[PDB]
Each structure stands twice: as C-alpha cells, then as structure tokens.
Design a protein around this ligand. Structure first.
Ligand code: HEM
Ligand SMILES: CC(C)(C)OC(=O)N[C@H](CS[C@H](Cc1ccccc1)C(=O)NCCc1cccnc1)Cc1ccccc1
Length: 456
C-alpha cells in the first residue's frame, strides 16, 4: 500500500485500491467487465493495482503503437511474470529480453507461409476426421457440444503438426498421448493468491512446484526425446526445430519447452474460437448461408480446400475477423516497462505493467457502430481500410505479436470450410441465446455452446 500512491502522484485517474488487495476485488465480474467499466468511467488512460503491482491501461492508438512496436526492444520487451514455471522459463512466450529475441529469431522461420503451406495437407486430413465424427452425431439427431468436437479436432491438428502423432482423439480420448496433452484461469484461487502474495513465486520455484503439471511435462520431455532419437536417425514443428538446432542454436530442453507451449496455444484457443464462430453462424443463419455459398463457389462439388483457395474466400475472412472482434480470447495485451520513459507526452515509471484492454477496445462504441452486434460487413474490403490496427488487435501487434497467427487462421479456416461443405448448424432449445460470457478469468461462454447439426 506504499506503491498505492503512484497513480495519484502522476495525476492518472483510477479506482481507489484496498490495502494488499489493490483493486482485485473488482475482478468479480471478470477482466472484461472491469476493463469496460474503467474505460467508461475514466477515459483514455487509467491506473489500477493487481495487489501491489501498478497497471496502467492505455487506449490511444498512437501510444499503443509506441508500446507495442516503436519501443518494444528498448523498453517494453516482456510480459508480466505470473507464477512458478520451472524449466518453462525457456518457452518463447515466457522468456525475456535477449533470450526471447534469440528464441523468436530461432522459431520465426518455422511459422513462414511456405512452411504453413506444407502443413495444409496434414491439417486437411483431420478435417476429414472431424466430418465423419460430426456425421455420426448428425445421423443420430442429438445436439452437439462444440467444445468437445472442436477440441478433438484442434488436438488432432496439434499432435500431427507438432510431432507426427496421428490420433483420432475424439474416439481415442484416452490414449496416453492425448491424456497428458489436454490437461490443465488467472482469477482462480491460486493466481489471485499469487497476485496478493507474489513473494511466494520464488518459494514455489525452489520447491519445483510448477503451474505446468509436472507429470504432463515429464511425459512430453521424454516423449520428445524418444521421437528425436527415432527420427535421428532413420514436416512438423519438431522436425523444423530439430533441423534448426542443426546449426546459439536451440538447446534440447529449450526445444521441449517450445513444443509444450505450441500445444496449448492452439489447443484451447483454436477450439474456443471455432466455437464462438459456430455460435454466431448458427444464430445468424444468413451469414451461414452466405458462407456456404462462397465455399461452394470456390470449391464446387465439395472440392477439398487448398492453401490458395482458403485465401481466396473473402467472406470467410470477414466472419473470422468479426468473431475475434467480439471474442479476443487474450482480452488484454501486456508489457512491463523496464525503464523510466515518456511516450506521447506521458511519463511512465519503471516497473509499471502497461496494458491494452483489447476486449474493451473491440467493443468501444467510439470506434465501432453497434459494437455488440455480429456484423461481418465491418471487415469488407471496402470498410476494412477504416479499422485501426491498434484498436483491433486479436493477435497482438509488433515484434511480440502472436507468432502463430497465420497458422491459427489457416487451421481454423480449413476447419470451417470442410464442416460447412457438409453441415448446417442450427440452435437448439438448449442453446444459450444470447450467449453469456464466463465471469471467470477466461474469455469463454458461461455455458458450453450446444447446437443442432444437419447433413447437407
Ligand atoms: C485463434 C488463435 C489465436 C489467437 C487469437 C492468438 C492470440 C495471441 C495474442 C493476442 C498474443 C499476444 C500478442 C502480443 O502480446 O501482442 C499471442 C501470443 C503468442 N501466440 Fe498466439 N493466438 C492464437 C493462436 C496461436 C497458435 C496456434 C500458436 C501456435 C504456436 C500461437 C503461439 C503464440 C506464441 C508463441 C505467442 C507469444 C509470442 C512471443 O512471446 O514472442 N498462438 N497470441
Ligand atoms: C490470456 C491471459 C493473460 C488473460 O491468461 C493466460 O492464459 N496467460 C497467458 C499464458 S496462456 C497459456 C498458458 C500456458 C499454458 C501451457 C504452457 C505455458 C503457458 C499459453 O500457452 N500461452 C502462450 C501461447 C498462447 C496462448 C494463448 C494464445 N496464443 C498463444 C499469457 C499469454 C496469453 C496469450 C498469448 C501469449 C501469452
């Protein structure tokens, strides 16, 4: 509470913090509601406290460009630490300063479009698996829980595109590989405690207690070392990383850490976003029909999608983009200010976490007409030019943006094309309309999305 005078000293408005807790009791309706309320009450900048940690929210696009792009290497290089991580210190998304810059360099060629284009046939084959599993539920007119069927698909693409492991996870839900990979919210009892007692992280570190379950990581560390020495010697991210350390080059533990970070990144996020898209499509049947029409036009006779035909589909892009406006699953972007700086006329002291409230800026009425409405036309080739890339930031911006952005969009778009070539999706009576968001620390629905699936 001796850090609680900072924003008052700088003349920055904000909610008044409680001793020890700072402002965290205000998270009782989730990050997103608190961000919106603060933006409304206070304006273009505000300040609050995760316990003793000061967080400065910013909403000026010039200033957001300074933090995310212009001054990224110099000042704003790292996100805030969040819990004991053990050897996952070395994952690209956790690493800092020159170690991150090194790993970002080492893994960037892995995510080029050319490498992605070679991944498309592997991503395509489990679209086919996705359809047959869905068709089994559509012929037995039982409502479908999207998270399970899409989770199984996302998991299927990951195991294949990252290790070559080919599993029908939905029907082998309990293969040892699928078990570890699925398993284990910054507003759960643990992480709030860490925010009130962030002195306790080094405690857990010397104790080898890790927020990554130690059994999953132990399983994958040894799984990788088997794969590595079965390929060595006798198309996936592991090969791409194995070829990279065939040179400063990627250590062996370092390689495992990135493998682990890739698996989750796209397990729950791809799965989650595909469900938000199928919700919107089901409650906006005209948007759905217009997409089936575009897909049939570009790929007649249920022609298999290809890398090039996917980038041909403009309405598909508009649907994806608009969904990520309403549900940017990151919610906020964050960088720690490593040096006293003054950017766009505002002094920022060292150690402040600077925060871009994406969810709140994606639903700002001052940049978006009817911002709560699902309106893909916002992203039409005509109107797309009028959208500020520092207000709409579903993948971040700048040198620390989502390295997997192009893979994710291609992964999800192949997912939707195949599924819409063969099915229409319709609300049930058990479908939650309007969808309510979870009051927790994740951007996800209050209730899981359930929809009726009919065969075309
Ligand atoms: C719909 C899917 C996804 C969305 C919306 C998304 C969004 C984001 C966002 C908002 C960030 C923070 C960017 C920033 O701080 O400016 C991020 C970081 C990151 N994402 Fe994604 N992401 C997605 C999928 C993926 C996938 C499939 C991968 C596959 C490897 C991935 C890997 C990463 C990595 C490694 C980082 C950290 C980048 C760094 O620290 O250098 N993400 N993502
Ligand atoms: C989004 C937020 C900050 C509100 O709560 C978080 O969950 N904490 C993020 C870590 S998320 C997840 C956690 C994890 C899981 C397994 C191993 C290590 C870490 C993770 O693997 N993260 C990196 C890849 C990723 C995640 C989501 C989207 N794209 C890529 C901090 C963070 C959040 C989003 C992007 C980058 C970092």
């Amino acid at each position: 509470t001796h850090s609680h005078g900072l924003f008052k000293k700088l003349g920055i408005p904000g909610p008044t913090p409680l001793p020890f807790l700072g402002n965290i009791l205000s998270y009782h309706k989730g990050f997103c509601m608190f961000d919106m309320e603060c933006h409304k009450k206070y304006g273009k900048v505000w300040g609050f406290y995760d316990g003793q940690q000061p967080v400065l929210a910013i909403t000026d696009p010039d200033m957001i460009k300074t933090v995310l792009v212009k001054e990224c290497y110099s000042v704003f290089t790292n996100r805030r630490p969040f819990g004991p991580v053990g050897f996952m210190k070395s994952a690209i998304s956790i690493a800092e300063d020159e170690e991150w810059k090194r790993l970002r360099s080492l893994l960037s060629p892995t995510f080029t479009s050319g490498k992605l284009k070679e991944m498309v046939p592997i991503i395509a084959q489990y679209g086919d698996v996705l359809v047959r599993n869905l068709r089994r539920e559509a012929e037995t007119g039982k409502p479908v829980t999207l998270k399970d069927v899409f989770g199984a698909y996302s998991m299927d693409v990951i195991t294949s595109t990252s290790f070559g492991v080919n599993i029908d996870s939905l029907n082998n839900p309990q293969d040892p590989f699928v078990e570890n990979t699925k398993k284990l919210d910054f507003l759960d009892p643990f992480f709030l405690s860490i925010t009130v007692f962030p002195f306790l992280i080094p405690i857990l570190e010397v104790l080898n207690i890790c927020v990554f379950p130690r059994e999953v990581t132990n399983f994958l560390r040894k799984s990788v070392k088997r794969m590595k020495e079965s390929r060595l010697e006798d198309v996936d991210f592991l090969q791409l990383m194995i070829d990279s350390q065939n040179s400063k080059a990627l250590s062996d533990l370092e390689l495992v850490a990135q493998s682990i970070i890739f698996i989750f990144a796209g397990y729950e996020t791809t799965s989650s976003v595909l469900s938000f898209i199928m919700y919107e499509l089901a409650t906006h049947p005209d948007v759905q029909q217009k997409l089936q029409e575009e897909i049939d036009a570009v790929l007649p006779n249920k022609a298999p999608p290809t890398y090039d035909t996917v980038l041909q589909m403009e309405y598909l892009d508009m649907v994806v983009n608009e969904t990520l406006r309403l549900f940017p699953i990151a919610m906020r972007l964050e960088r720690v200010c490593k040096k006293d700086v003054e950017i766009n006329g505002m002094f920022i002291p060292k150690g402040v976490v600077v925060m871009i409230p994406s969810y709140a800026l994606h639903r700002d009425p001052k940049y978006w007409t009817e911002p709560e409405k699902f309106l893909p036309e916002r992203f039409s080739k005509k109107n797309k030019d009028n959208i500020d890339p520092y207000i709409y930031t579903p993948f971040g911006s700048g040198p620390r943006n989502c390295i997997g952005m192009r893979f994710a969009l291609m992964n999800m778009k192949l997912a939707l094309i195949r599924v819409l070539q063969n099915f229409s999706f319709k609300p049930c009576k058990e479908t939650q309309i309007p969808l309510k968001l979870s009051l927790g620390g994740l951007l996800q629905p209050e209730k899981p999305v359930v929809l009726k699936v009919e065969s075309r």
